[PDB]
């Protein structure tokens, strides 16, 4: 169970190359905006905030070929979990990339990807996708997940900033 914290803003930039690729909203902190806040569109999540102004908020998109954020996630294989981390994203595949899994379970394609809740972005449960496949599939730590995002920012212009309510989640 779980208590969160919202803010719904104005897309003002929208940056339009591939190297880079974020959006400005036109709230931030004296609205209430927060380091630890995940970005959703659409039902799902499209991005991290990397910084809070005092009246905006810049958010890293999870399109981005690599990704620093350290965005827990975890995929659900039947009654298993599996939690790993969001490190990129194949643009050529169209697939997000994870890693650091704590398990070696069976991950099946259509497993579905939800945010894991564990690290900075402490907000769990948000949809993220569903699995494709994995690689290095037999490497003792560095089996990789491939994941296709259930939404994205196209032709929207309002997103949602999410985090976590409670002081120390435990």
């Given at each position: 169970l779980q208590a969160t914290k919202t803010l719904a803003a104005d897309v003002i930039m929208r940056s339009p190359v591939s190297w880079k690729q974020e959006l400005t909203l036109d709230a931030g902190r004296s609205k209430g905006?927060?380091?630890n806040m995940l970005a959703i569109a659409n039902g799902g999540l499209i991005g991290s905030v990397s910084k809070v102004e005092e009246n905006s908020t810049i958010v890293n998109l999870?399109?981005?070929?690599?990704?620093?954020?350290?965005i827990s996630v975890k995929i659900q294989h039947g009654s298993t979990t599996i939690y790993g981390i969001i490190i990129g994203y194949d643009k050529e595949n169209d697939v997000l990339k994870i890693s650091q899994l704590n398990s070696n379970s069976d991950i099946s394609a259509g497993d579905k990807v939800t945010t894991g809740?564990?690290?900075?972005?402490?907000?769990?449960?948000?949809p993220v996708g569903e699995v494709v496949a994995t690689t290095h599939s037999t490497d003792y730590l560095t089996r990789e997940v491939t994941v296709k995002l259930s939404?994205?920012?196209?032709?929207?212009?309002v997103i949602e900033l999410v985090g976590n309510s409670k002081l120390v989640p435990r």
């Open positions: 905006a927060s380091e999870l399109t981005n070929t690599e990704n620093a954020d350290k809740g564990l690290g900075n972005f402490n907000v769990a449960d948000i939404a994205d920012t196209h032709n929207v212009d």
